[PDB]
Amino acid sequence: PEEEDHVLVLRKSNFAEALAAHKYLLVEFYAPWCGHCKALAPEYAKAAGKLKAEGSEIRLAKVDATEESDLAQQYGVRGYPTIKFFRGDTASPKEYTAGREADDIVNWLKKRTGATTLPDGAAAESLVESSEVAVIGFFKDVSDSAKQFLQAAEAIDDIPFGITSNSDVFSKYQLDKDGVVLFKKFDEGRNNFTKENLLDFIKHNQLPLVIEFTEQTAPKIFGGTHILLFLPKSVSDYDGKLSNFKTAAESFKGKILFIFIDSDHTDNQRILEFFGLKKEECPAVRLITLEEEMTKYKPESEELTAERITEFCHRFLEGKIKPHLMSQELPEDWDKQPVKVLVGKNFEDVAVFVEFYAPWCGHCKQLAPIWDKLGETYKVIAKMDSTANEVEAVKVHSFPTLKFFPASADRTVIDYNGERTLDGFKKFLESGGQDGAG
Amino acid sequence: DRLYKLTYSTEVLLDRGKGKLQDSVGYRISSNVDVALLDDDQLIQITMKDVNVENVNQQRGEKSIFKGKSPSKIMGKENLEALQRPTLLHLIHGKVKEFYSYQNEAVAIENIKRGLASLFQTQSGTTNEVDISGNCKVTYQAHQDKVIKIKALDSCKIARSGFLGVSSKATSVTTYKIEDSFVIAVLAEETHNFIKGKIVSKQKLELKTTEMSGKQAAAIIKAVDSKYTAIPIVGQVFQSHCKGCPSLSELWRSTRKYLQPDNLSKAEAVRNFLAFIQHLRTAKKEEILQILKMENKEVLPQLVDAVTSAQTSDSLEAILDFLDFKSDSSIILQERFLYACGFASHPNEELLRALISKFKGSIGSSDIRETVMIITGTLVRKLCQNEGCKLKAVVEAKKLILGGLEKAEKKEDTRMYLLALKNALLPEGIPSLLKYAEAGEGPISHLATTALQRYDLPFITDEVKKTLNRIYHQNRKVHEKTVRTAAAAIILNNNPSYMDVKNILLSIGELPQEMNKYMLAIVQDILRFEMPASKIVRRVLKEMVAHNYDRFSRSGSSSAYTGYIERSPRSASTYSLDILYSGSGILRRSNLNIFQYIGKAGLHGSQVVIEAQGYAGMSAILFDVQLRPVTFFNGSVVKGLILLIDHSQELQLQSGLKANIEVQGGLAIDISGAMKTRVKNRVTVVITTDITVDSSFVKAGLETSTETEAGLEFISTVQFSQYPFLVCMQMDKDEAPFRQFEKKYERLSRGYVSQKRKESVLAGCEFPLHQENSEMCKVVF
DSSP states (O other), rough: EETTTTEEEEEESSHHHHHHHHHEEEEEEEEEHHHHHHHHHHHHHHHHHHHHHHTOOOOOEEETTTTHOOOOOOOOOTTTTTTEOOOOOOOOOOOOOOSSHHHHHHHHHHHHOBBBOOOOOOOTTTTSSSSEEEEEEEEEEEOOSSSHHHHHHOOOSEEEBBOOHHHHHHHTTTOOOEEEEEOSSSSSEEEOOOHHHHHHHHHHHHSOSEOOOTTHHHHHHHHOEEEOOOOOTSSSSSHHHHHHHHHHHHHHHSSSSEEOOOSSSSSGGGHHHHOSSSSSOOOOOEEEEOOOSSEEEOOOOSOHHHHHHHHHHHHHHHOOOOOOOOOOOOTTTTTSSSSEEEOOTTTTOOEEEEEEOOOSSSHHHHHHHHOOOHHHHHEEEEEEEEEOOSSSSSSOOSOOOOOOSSTTTOOOOOOOOOOOTTTTHHHHHHTSSSSSSO | OOOEEEEEEEEEEESSSSSSSSOOOOOOEEEEEEEEHHHHHHHEEEEEEEEEEEEOOOTTTSSSSSSOOOOHHHHHHHHHHHHHSSSEEEEEEEEEEEEEEEEOOHHHHHHHHHHHHHHOOOOEEEEEOOOSEEEEEEEEESSSSEEEEEEEEEEEEEEOOOOOOOOOOOOOOEEEESSSSSSEEEOOOOOOEEEOOOEEEEEEEEEEEEEOOOSSTTTTTHHHHHTTTTOSSSSOOOOOOOSSSTOOOOHHHHHHSSSSGGGGHHHHHHHHHHHHHHHHHHHHHHHHHHHHHOOOSHHHHHHHHHHHHHOOHHHHHHHHHHHHHHHHSOHHHHHHHHHHHHHHSOOOOOHHHHHHHHHHOOOOOOHHHHHHHHHHHHHHHHHHHHTTSSHHHHHHHHHHHHHHHHHHHHHHHHHHHHHHHHHHHHHHGGGHHHHHHHHSSSHHHHOOOOHHHOOOOOTOHHHHHHHHHHHHSSSSSOOHHHHHHHHHHHHSSOOOHHHHHHHHHTTTTSHHHHHHHHHHHHHHHHHHHHOTTTHHHHHHHHHHTOHHHHHHHOOOOOOOOOEEEEEEEEEEEEEEEEEEETTSSSSEEEEEOOOEEEEEEEEEEEEEEEEOOOEEEOOOOOOOOBBOOOOOOOOOEEEEEEEEEOOEEHHHEETTEEEEEEEEEEEHHHOEEEEEOEEEEEEEEEEEEEEEEESSSEEEEEEEEEEEEEEOEEEEEEOOOSSSOEEEEEOOOOEEEEEEEEEEEEEEEOOEEEEEOOOEEEEEEEEEOOOHHHHHHHOOO
């Protein structure tokens, strides 16, 4: 195997050889273009040098997952900075989700080899705030349930479980009996507690209610229905709107994820324009589902407050919440003109004969007096601005593809192909659509 | 055994294919035929009495020239009695042994008697029989009382020259209504169903009533008459009348001022273009060569294209003797010669051996020498797709391209052979192309990659896609972005794998935003068009790591749109305009693709690729023919009158009639680029379908000059006053007239002449591209 800066290089010819030879090997399925792999490679080399200079059998190795996609396809690797480790007989590698630096890897491998201990005179700081979410396990006999707690501690590698046997720590953390408390630095800081309810409790309390939309947080968001909020950071009462969003997030924590995104930054304007909102409403609330189909939902009440945003997720859970479309509704003076407009909003209740025109084409500009005269003579014929609205039944590559609307809602598509004159359409409408259609 | 008194008619029809319409018709030649019998060898006498020509469309009545002309006047003095002069035939087991007649007569009058005697030479079986047409796979379908004779006219071996295509059918179901011993009626359907025409021949020989000793039949033919000499049963080529009179001072002078360079846009000018080609095909070598001796050079390229569009033995020698390849003054004439040879629907090996000898010759212009090799690969591609790759010329040409590319000593030769291999479509150039795709030179690899893009899915394997992966993913070295996107376009189109789509979508965002917008738009255009590759993309997008809106939201200027100009469940025509801009928004590779499909098959109709950097160059494709790419600068752009299709199967009908099914389609193009930049695509489709039936004493014709104009002009409305690039793309089609024609003839060497005319104006609309481009363009609106 090729060794560079004490890092084995695997190109499907030595990966199996390296894993069968080195029992304790750290795996990296990196990519040439990814900036995460670009930053990880010096850290990977530093950790490989730290392990190699020490007298330990563990080392590090990188695999180009782009050129070696079979390893990613067999294992199930879905990320480029993904770090894994294969020990004995086939087992799932430890999902490395901690800090990707060298000494962090050195501390992390000790957990996977088979909790952390610190002196109790750390001024009650190091044990609790060693990391962002650090759990301390309290037990007088570090048994029947203590061994179960230790097994749960060893179940998750990414959580730095604590060991406590000193008597003053039990009283200082105010526990009459043995228990598990999750500590954090963002939401509450303390959450006191089948063999799975403890893991569910830790995963539920570890989850932050609100997430600032950034590059770093983004892979964890889709890793786990993200109700967004295009709230400017410099908006009027940013704190109050954010507190209302937090109170909304307290109602729905795990099923619906709450993300607040600053609309002031131009890097988020692409996210703004993906939903269609060109910063029309600063406190606007949109829910996006990304399960194989991007369906951006529309809240029922645009009069939105803390309660409205709070129960909007319940409204979405009811299933009655409709998707959002950029289709304008019925115009103000539709009744005055003999030809009326049946928009995509009214394309089912009111939409008789429909047509799908476009103000783009100059031939449609020339036909506008002709279509005015046809409607003036026939004083229902519907023109539809499909550039702004959307057609659900069919698509129009050639936009004046006339679909003759039937009677009694037995929908059929028959293409009129006349000469675009003021008399041909009158002759088509003189037969009631029986002649000239299709 | 005795004299048989039968009546005969020769029904000739020239339909337009409507289904039931008496718009155009042909003459009916009628006679009362007396047949007398003069081992299974037998000799008979066939005599034509009461021979007269009548019309079957008597609705007009006396509008034709059959009124006031005697039957003697119509056919002439000698030919009326020549048909009335008896003819002989030797028949063995229902097949033609030998055909005997006086032979001192016109060819066409003998053809009628040759078609008349074939009804007694018939048999449930299949063979190559002897008849009027020649040697064809003849399907005998015997019924319980009658027999159906189906003749595969594709399998006919005759001397007549029979050769973006024209489909045809040649159903020749012939019914010999036979009751007791011989023909009591004949129902001979001779439909040639090929803008379409149904030219129908029919003959009705009905028996009404009836009333030399020797062991050898060899001398009996001489004993009846000494002039009864040997002649074939197959008809011969004749031209009793003017026919294709050359008339260089007369006929060419008529079309000299109807093909002027100033009115090439007009479809009336292009209508005379196809007429003069039909004259030159039935013309001798010295006749065509004399026209170009003192012709004007300004109207010469139309004549050069017209001569080259004939594609006969003498005309090819005439144009090659006229055009001196060593002469560097006539750049355009050889270039028009090469293009028309490239656009020839039926190129020949002698032309290929000539063009090989041209490359072996001392060609003064290297661009023409490059153009020869580009056409040489085009001829090889047509021949190897016509089961001719094993030819002595083809292997010589393949070794010129393959060996020259493998062993290259000059930079221009590599660029010449890359363009040549692009037209060649040789599967053995793939190891050379993948070598040149990874060679590290920009234009060389990009031309090779686009050459690889011309290759199909069976010609691209997993190893080929893995070879292009290192170009796109940049595993080993850096490549230019146009090469990687083209390589990504090949992989996504030519059966991508699950991980291949998986890795490409993950690359979006990490690439520069100029490439990110285009690469997103390519996958976006994949999803919109419901491609078969999109199902794999849908399985990749099923996971949340690929369907995330972080990658789907990109601020860029590039685009990739594909739509249908026309679509039907039987066939469809597609177009696309995938323009990739730079980081600053400058255009880099705009791919204007024009495609046409017919059922399962499809033909790349056109492709104009405008490329800019900082150089400025354009690449032109016309109907599966990569032309020589044109560079505007470095450090009347496209103009030509050319043919598209040619179906000129000179049929010999079962009744003994000469049917010339000539379908020609030509256009005049004028593509000029001026920079606000516009590119025009001026198309004038002029289809002149002709089906003329002649027998040198009665003439009938039908001409359908369905001519259509078109135009697809793209405008790059770009505003660069502000820091964002306000780039608006718009392809504007202007109004073009649509016209149809129909002519009818019934002559006997004014006549039954009529003209039908229709006219329509097609409204033109701007192409909307995609709605993202529509937002910037609505500032103009």
